[PDB]
Symmetry: D2
Subunit: 262 residues, 4 copies
Amino acid sequence: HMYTDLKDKVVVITGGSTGLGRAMAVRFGQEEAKVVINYYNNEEEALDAKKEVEEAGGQAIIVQGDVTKEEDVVNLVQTAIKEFGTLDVMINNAGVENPVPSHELSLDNWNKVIDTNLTGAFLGSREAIKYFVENDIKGNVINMSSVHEMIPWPLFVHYAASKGGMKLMTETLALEYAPKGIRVNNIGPGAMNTPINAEKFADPVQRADVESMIPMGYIGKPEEVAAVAAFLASSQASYVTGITLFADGGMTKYPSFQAGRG
Amino acid sequence: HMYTDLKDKVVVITGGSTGLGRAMAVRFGQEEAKVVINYYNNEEEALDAKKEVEEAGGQAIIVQGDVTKEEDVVNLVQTAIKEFGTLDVMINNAGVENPVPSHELSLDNWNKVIDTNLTGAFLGSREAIKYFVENDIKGNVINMSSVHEMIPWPLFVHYAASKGGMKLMTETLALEYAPKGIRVNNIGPGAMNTPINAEKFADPVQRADVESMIPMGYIGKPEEVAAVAAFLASSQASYVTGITLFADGGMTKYPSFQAGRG
Amino acid sequence: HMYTDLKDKVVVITGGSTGLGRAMAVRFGQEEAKVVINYYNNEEEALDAKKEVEEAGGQAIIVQGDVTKEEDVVNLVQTAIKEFGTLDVMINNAGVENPVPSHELSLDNWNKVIDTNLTGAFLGSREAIKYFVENDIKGNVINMSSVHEMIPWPLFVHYAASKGGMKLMTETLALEYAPKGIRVNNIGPGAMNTPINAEKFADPVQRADVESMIPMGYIGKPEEVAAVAAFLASSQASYVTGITLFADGGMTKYPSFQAGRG
Amino acid sequence: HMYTDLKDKVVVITGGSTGLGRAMAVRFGQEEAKVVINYYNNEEEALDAKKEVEEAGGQAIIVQGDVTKEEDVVNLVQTAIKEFGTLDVMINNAGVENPVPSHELSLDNWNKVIDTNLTGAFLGSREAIKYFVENDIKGNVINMSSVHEMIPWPLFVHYAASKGGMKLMTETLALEYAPKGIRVNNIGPGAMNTPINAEKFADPVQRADVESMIPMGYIGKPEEVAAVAAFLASSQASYVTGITLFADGGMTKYPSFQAGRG
Ligand SMILES: NC(=O)C1=CN([C@@H]2O[C@H](COP(=O)(O)OP(=O)(O)OC[C@H]3O[C@@H](n4cnc5c(N)ncnc54)[C@H](O)[C@@H]3O)[C@@H](O)[C@H]2O)C=CC1
Ligand SMILES: NC(=O)C1=CN([C@@H]2O[C@H](COP(=O)(O)OP(=O)(O)OC[C@H]3O[C@@H](n4cnc5c(N)ncnc54)[C@H](O)[C@@H]3O)[C@@H](O)[C@H]2O)C=CC1
């Protein structure tokens, strides 16, 4: 396979049962890693995800957990160490979103998105870094951000805030723990072909509208994001820390400015 | 009288009893505005500040409120509209911070900083914009950020995350409500001479270290930031929205590279 | 009279005979400054502008010069010091642009834009700072940039590159000369109502397309930018150096994401 | 090997005889690519570089050329196509630098650095894109930038300007040619162990000073940058365009802020 240093590394992935999380689980499985698949409630998809990792060449366990509960995040990292003996790569991928005019967004709805997308990632990063620090492991954290840590997002002010926060969180942790050889990075996906979007992307006018925001002209395949994760996790990225690697087909480059407009 | 257009405008300021909030309160008093001074803890300080605003030529009330409580933020804007008749400028300035190695940061401590620094500003921004939209007012929001929406801050990952989040919140709201003429900006102070830093700056070793990180060579004066706030609230900045204006003596320009090191 | 501290300050402005440079010339006249109007091509325009500055309450000369010629830039600053006694504010505003598919852009055409937009501002900045350093003056430099130091611009790769370069030049000079109290900032205009755009904005289809890319919904007025320049040159912005202040009606916030598309 | 899609791809590298250029040449040779090594005057190092690529498993030619001469850049890309049949990846790596107080920097010295570091890269990118466009190849451009497209650099205002320009150049070309499947990216190296630095890094106090600017605590090995180039060139980065991938051991994260300072 591609990244031989990933062989037998322990990789924890929150929200790893579907979409980008699942595609990363499979990709690490192709690198013969040991994958720990976290999931919220859908056991059967998690079980499905588990079998793919094994069929791709990896070992895999599944572990239920809500990333807004501190005990569940703590339990997740502990289960990883118990079952597989160590922890090498931590991937905070869980996320939720919903459209609301910002002046109408409730505090409860704001909190759900902040608690899930930002705080969940802090909790995961923290538990992983604690472990690397205590055991002198030169481990790796990948936080799943979005083009919306840079691109503002009307109707999604909670989501945008959560990812803008994630960017400074990641950059801080990278600076703080760089002297220990612990690397911390964001991946910034653009529009991706995942379950959350299956409804929207079946509709031809909506699919075309979205593709018109993508300079490369196509909706990303989850494996293209998983390719970025494998690179970032591997020793090929040994000197790469504190960055956001956008995988967005050019979306952060301002799609409205194609053909020299404005 | 510099910004004549500010005369009789209603300006609400959270944490307006001390430091930067106080300086802003005074300055808008100097512009003959109607300043609403929110405070959490210390009525005696708020009273002392209410006096300065009045002496400087402004009108002022004080309103107790905790920015982490929705009812208190809603109450604050409603009080402003009761007492002064309307709302023109909403300044979300309240903030807290404390150093903790990130892998040792507790969830409650992380939540306290996020709730105060980011969510409080969301609540502030939401209530003001709600009022602007329902009443066809071309209102203005100033969110008080930090060099640390750009500069990562080891030991302060909660703070850094809250301001990185504030950046994207501001940018989103500016984009979302620009067609209504409602403008939303951040100010980014560097190291400022305020109570929050009084401990640090007393120690001449610590004061010198902080100063060695400011290219302009001096710790900022709170009036230098209030000058930026008066500009942004004024019609002078009519085409200016969604920005962060750093008032930092050069701090975001990378202190370590002075004289060309590296 | 807004910024009383600007009275009798010597302000040099390249391309000060038309558009934004003219608006800045007028505005500093309104602050009772001594405006030096550089121009390349059209004395009759420069004369018409010299008049406005004088009517608005300022003192003004005109000086012919090509900003791509070192001798002309050196001459310009030397003329300013001859005629008015000193130099306080140096504004590098001259710029050119033309659309060409990048793979068809000639080296001479690329050079013309770089030489004019970036190198001319370097020469301007260098000569002013040289004068500030030798004479212990806490001078000020405003470099006129664009949304396109951040927004990429197909068909205008030369322009975009010149302003991206201007950004780092400004930031470097701000860092390098901050300990001397010399401040250096950029302004970043979006789509502005100037001669350079008169062709584009005459066509009602083209005017509407440009407007659909401004969140605030209108093409900027040149006085809105001159208001930003007066602020930055003034002592109100005493702690502000090394920044880019965008005056763009929200354009850097990603036009394509209005109403929450994507 | 690692990236099997790189097998037999034609890769042109300017300044490919030494340092980062040489390390990329060798790394592509390890991927069994066909490497075209450009060089300014040192034929013997270029010859040395050539033999390494072959010994690593690649094909390789050397071609003399000065990137400030348009004909030399044109000849380089033509020689690549002539000799190897096509062009797949273009790498603009040539660069020069020297320290000068900015107010003392000559126009000739400014131009040399601009012409080499920025214009050379425009010329290379242009000739490559022309070829990809004319022949419907989904090719790849990698422009060698620096941490100094983001980190300002006193005494190196020409270098900083050149790389700030390179950033907007790359981003523009990525947006412009994304619909054609042509990807364009920057790599941003921090302090790297290359010949230009051998003098500085032999001295223990200077080596320690530099390492103190690096959060990861070590000077980068050229192969760590070449690892980024291989990733970016490969189809693993299929959805990655218009980005700068910093490989700097955390240098852009503000080294002066370690341990919670300021
Ligand atoms: N002083 C500095 O060097 C810098 C401060 N700025 C920011 O500017 C703002 C102003 O702070 P300073 O005046 O410097 O310090 P400060 O501590 O004097 O002011 C902060 C204010 O926030 C208030 N506050 C805290 N929690 C609150 C709550 N739950 N509800 C209502 N009010 C609450 C405090 O009562 C206080 O008056 C802060 O957001 C700070 O983060 C950021 C960058 C640097
Ligand atoms: N108008 C707009 O929408 C925007 C313009 N700004 C920038 O603001 C600046 C002002 O331009 P505008 O007033 O809008 O257009 P303009 O074309 O009216 O002004 C540009 C000025 O530069 C001068 N100039 C050109 N080459 C010169 C040379 N070699 N030597 C001396 N002067 C020379 C011209 O004579 C002209 O007066 C420009 O740098 C432009 O790039 C940037 C963003 C948007």
